[PDB]
Design a protein around this nucleic acid. Structure first.
Lengths: 147, 201, 116, 64
RNA sequence: GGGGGGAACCUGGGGAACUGAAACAUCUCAGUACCCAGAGGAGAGGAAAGAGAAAUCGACUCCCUGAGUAGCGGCGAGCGA
RNA sequence: CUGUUGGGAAGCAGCGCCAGAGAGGGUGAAAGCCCCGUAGGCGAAAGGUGGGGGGAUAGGUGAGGGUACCCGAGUACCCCGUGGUUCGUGGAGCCAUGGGGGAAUCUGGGCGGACCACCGCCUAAGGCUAAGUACUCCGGGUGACCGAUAGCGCACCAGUACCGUGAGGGAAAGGUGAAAAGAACCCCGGGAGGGGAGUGAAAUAGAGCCUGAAACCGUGGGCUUACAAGCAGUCACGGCCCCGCAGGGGUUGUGGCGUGCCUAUUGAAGCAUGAGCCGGCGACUCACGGUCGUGGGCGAGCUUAAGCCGUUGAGGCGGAGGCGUAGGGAAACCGAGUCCGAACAGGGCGCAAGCGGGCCGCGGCCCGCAAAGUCCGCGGCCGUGGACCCGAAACCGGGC
RNA sequence: GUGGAGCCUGGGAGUGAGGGCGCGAGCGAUAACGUCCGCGUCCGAGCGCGGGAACAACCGAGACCGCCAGCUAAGGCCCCC
RNA sequence: GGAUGACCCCAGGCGGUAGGGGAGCGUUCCCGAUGCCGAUGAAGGCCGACCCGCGAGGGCGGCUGGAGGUAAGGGAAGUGC
RNA sequence: GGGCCUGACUGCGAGGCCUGCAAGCCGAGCAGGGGCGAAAGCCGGGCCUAGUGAACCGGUGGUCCCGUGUGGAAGGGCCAU
């Protein structure tokens, strides 16, 4: 395997579409922009703009709390993980040991959740849902609850 | 698991565990990334506001019978700036470590799969001098009919091999798929062979 | 890097200009002028190719018709005669006959009055 | 430079779990006497925006 | 001792409009362009009457992130810790 | 080094050699070994630097008890007018302060987003402080940078010529050859120029100089043309010239046919736009985001950023962080559910995982194959920037 | 009824000045190469080809290329032809 | 049919502006390159009635030119008037 | 024409009309609590099709959902208007 062999698979590299470069191309003259009018010009935001009529968005009404200065309130937050996700572990499970595993995102208080089979496991968590608690306290799990 | 010709004074002798199949595309994606990140990207041009001329309307919008123009920096002028000309950029991008890891892996694998790989215990009487290296390479089946990536942390051996045209030298932390693919024959230390396997662990 | 026009344009221009040798004045001197004649030359050669097939047939039919009124009957009759006869010698060759081999044509004329 | 989330959207719309765009029914912010309780009751419900326009609003929210 | 000069770079004292908002005045462009004064090989900042919720941190600058988050906003365009 | 072809060898051939140096450039062409170099190494009396080494000096250092002396004033603080911050008057604090009022010295004061109470934080109204940062006139190094319409405006005696009263504007213009060997002398000529001679490998390399395209102008040759009607061509046949020896090439007498190109348009040969002709320059890009598609990597996971180390076209480390793994709700919250509701009706928005093949006494659960996802490459499109290129009338600032 | 039919999901569009003709109406004057709708068509994009003297849209006919072969459409068959 | 782009047979489609898509050509530059072509002549220029390709083009030959050129396969754009 | 009455209900809403969007329109049925009826049953305004106004910004009532270190409070949210 030398240099002249190194080749990218079919369609791994593909030609650009070069417009405005002669009739046979496609693609020439107008350059796929049709005839006249802004959009053919060099240069309006079509996600929002709608022609001077009141937009689709701006006629919808606002909902709920927008928050005000000095902005967002620090309260604790809870990420759930599902009993099924607890599957790969043996012995004791903490939030710490959940993060460093990529199940529980950092700075999130841990809340065990229902979906899945309770494993007879010591699980240390900031919170348990109902059917999570029952399930565990029935497969012989040990639901330590910290603060 | 590959049987690799090691080279000791105490006999030739043969075990590797290197990738089974070789992805050529993956090999390619690394090189590309290797040759792309080393780009200078010092190609530049001047926009029409970067061009040294004024911005005075050379002649009236109307009634001259000449066409309409603003300043002469307009790219439409021979004086003018270039339109979408090169600006210094950075062709570097971050190739997924795994891919790098697999390429080194697959690059060496391919080569070994061709009995072009040769590990050595040490380097006979090479103590710096280029002829000293010649000697040794001859005794090892390295006549310069084939081109060699010679990988060793041994400063002295690299110095001896360096000025050869058919040799590309390299400390082991420097191993890389391109310098492998360039060269016909890979030749390494045990001591380099280790760091190599450590790179792919 | 920069890819200046360099060599390309001149060459595409000569190609056309060589294709335009013969034409009157600028049509054979000016590239642009060359291109415009060649476009026209283009369609004409197509259009007249198709047309050449029907220029010769009209001629054959003229030539035959004359030879036919020598033996006392008209092209339209005669042709009807052939079809009835079951003679399908194309009128390219009908023509040739009428001018190279009078006798055979004269044979063909009789089979034609015959089958009528 | 990175897109900015349209706050005007963010503040009157939620993208669902399956990718639909949901908003409050219009029609009850005032002028509400003389409207049936049927009307009012229903206008209290979140609805799903026709697909053509759901897609646009979805591009105003690139970081949801 | 000062005075004057110096391509940019810096701090300060002043400070637009085109334009964007498919009009426009709040908004935007922007504390940008520019004018002025001063500094220097850098300049500014700098040892908490700080941060803000952790029984926390511990000067200032600068980079990545936080984050187009919090919020700001004819809750428009947009602005943005 | 030698031969060899050549004007010239570094080409080709024979036999050698150096290499910590086979980067590059010169030499009559194509040189490791001829030249300048290159790897590796050495070097300053003088001046500058000296953030590294050392030396010195300034300067610096406790505990309890008691006293209540001091702890930065037109300040803090409050009100009025503003500015800064994400904060546009907003529930508007905080920081700065033009106006008015105007304290206290630790049981003092400011702050933690109006205010209050707790609980905490910090000590305003004096000042200095390296480094990490920005820039690039200047030196050097390197380019998937340009190569004389390019690249700076300037490769050249260019901020010049020239233009403008001035601020200010602002060009064009590079090449004989290896070596001037730059063409003695003679001949036509007032000169210019030219013919010989001479130099040269080459002189349509002769200085108005490498290559020497096209428009354009001539000369000579072939075919053709003075009863002919035209977007100039095409088809056919014919004659004359040419190359050759069933064929080609050139031309065109006659016959058929035939409304330029572009643009703009319902519609253009159009008496609608643009174009004298030729040459050169000229317009869908890039960055960061986004969204599909796609080639790959890995997959309940995937990926690093800045940095650090290494390299001197070698890569590695760095898990901060981001995206994914759960949703629903304005939110508290609850959670495979959740919101509305009195509901254990009804409804909105959510929730179900692959395909195997086998071992074993029905899946126990392996094992493979595939995939959520994600990372990079590629491409299409979108956002933000001048965003395909050229063009206003104008607005504003500072100058003349 | 297997067709460049159809339905579903997504990427990319252009288009949003039409026009003539037949027919149905409104307007107009049982005017206009008029105007405004409906059904259809063709030009647009078939100013390619035959007819119609000429001639986008009337008749005929949807041109991948070549042929000095044949049948035809509309239209024609006195000479131009 | 064969066994997956290898060709053969048979049938059908192949007017076309905006426009969508697909396959190519050529220009500059990088890897390939301490290589290969090169004074027994590079690039470039002028010819050609010759070869290959549907085509863009690519060869081959002659003249000029006198020092460069740059493959198979890939990469990147100041890429075709 | 009269009797009693407040269904000119509050939770919802299978399924449809219409429709580019946004809206507009019809609605049987389950639950709460009622009206009239002996009952079957009917009643979620008016014989029907016009009598209307998207968001933003505010006012009032309720709710007690957030409340910037904590308890409150300021201010917002939700339901109604």
């Amino acid at each position: 395997m030398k240099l002249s062999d190194l080749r990218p698979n079919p369609g791994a590299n593909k030609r650009r579409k070069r417009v405005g470069r002669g009739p046979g191309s496609g693609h020439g003259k107008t350059a796929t922009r049709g005839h006249k009018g802004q959009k053919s010009r060099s240069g309006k935001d079509p996600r929002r703009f709608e022609g001077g009529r009141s937009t689709t968005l701006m006629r919808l009404p606002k909902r709920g709390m927008q928050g005000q200065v000095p902005g967002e309130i620090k309260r604790p937050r809870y990420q759930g993980v599902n009993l099924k996700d607890l599957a790969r572990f043996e012995g004791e499970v903490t939030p710490e040991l959940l993060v460093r595993a990529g199940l529980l995102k950092k700075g999130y208080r841990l809340k065990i959740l229902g979906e899945g089979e309770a494993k007879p496991l010591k699980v240390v968590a900031h919170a348990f849902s109902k059917s999570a608690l029952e399930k565990l306290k029935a497969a012989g799990g040990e639901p330590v609850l910290l603060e | 698991v590959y049987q690799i010709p090691v080279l000791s004074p105490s006999g030739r002798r043969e075990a590797a565990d290197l990738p089974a199949e070789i992805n050529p595309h993956l090999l390619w994606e690394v090189v590309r990334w290797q040759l792309a990140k080393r780009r200078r990207g010092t190609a530049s041009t001047k926009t029409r506001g970067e061009v040294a001329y004024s911005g005075r309307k050379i002649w009236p919008q109307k009634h001259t019978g000449r066409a309409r123009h603003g300043d002469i920096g307009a790219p439409i002028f021979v004086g003018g700036g270039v339109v979408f000309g090169p600006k210094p950029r950075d062709y570097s991008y971050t190739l997924p470590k795994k891919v790098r890891k697999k390429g080194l892996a697959m690059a060496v694998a391919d080569r070994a799969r061709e009995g072009k790989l040769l590990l050595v215990e040490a380097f006979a009487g090479v103590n710096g001098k280029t002829k000293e290296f010649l000697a040794w390479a001859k005794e090892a089946g390295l006549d310069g009919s084939e081109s060699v990536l010679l990988v060793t942390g041994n400063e002295l051996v690299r110095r001896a091999a360096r000025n050869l045209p058919w040799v590309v030298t390299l400390a082991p932390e420097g191993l890389n798929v391109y310098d492998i693919v360039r060269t016909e024959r890979l030749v390494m230390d045990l001591d380099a062979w280790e760091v190599f396997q450590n790179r792919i662990g | 890097p920069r890819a200046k026009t360099g060599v390309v344009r001149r060459r595409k221009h000569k190609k056309i200009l060589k294709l335009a040798k013969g034409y009157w004045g600028l049509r054979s001197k000016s590239f642009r002028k060359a291109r415009e004649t060649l476009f026209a030359a283009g369609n004409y050669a197509y259009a007249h190719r198709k047309r050449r097939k029907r220029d010769f047939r009209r001629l054959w039919i003229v030539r035959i018709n004359a030879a036919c009124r020598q033996h006392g009957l008209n092209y339209s009759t005669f042709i009807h005669g052939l079809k009835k006869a079951g003679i399908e010698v194309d009128r390219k060759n009908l023509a040739d006959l009428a001018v190279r081999e009078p006798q055979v044509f004269a044979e063909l004329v009789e089979r034609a009055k015959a089958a009528q | 430079p990175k897109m900015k989330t349209h706050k005007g959207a963010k503040k009157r719309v939620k993208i669902t779990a399956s990718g639909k765009v949901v908003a409050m029914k219009t029609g009850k912010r005032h002028l509400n006497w003389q409207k049936s309780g049927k009307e009012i009751r229903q206008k209290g419900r979140k609805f799903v925006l026709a697909k053509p326009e759901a897609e646009r609003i979805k591009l105003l929210l690139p970081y949801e």
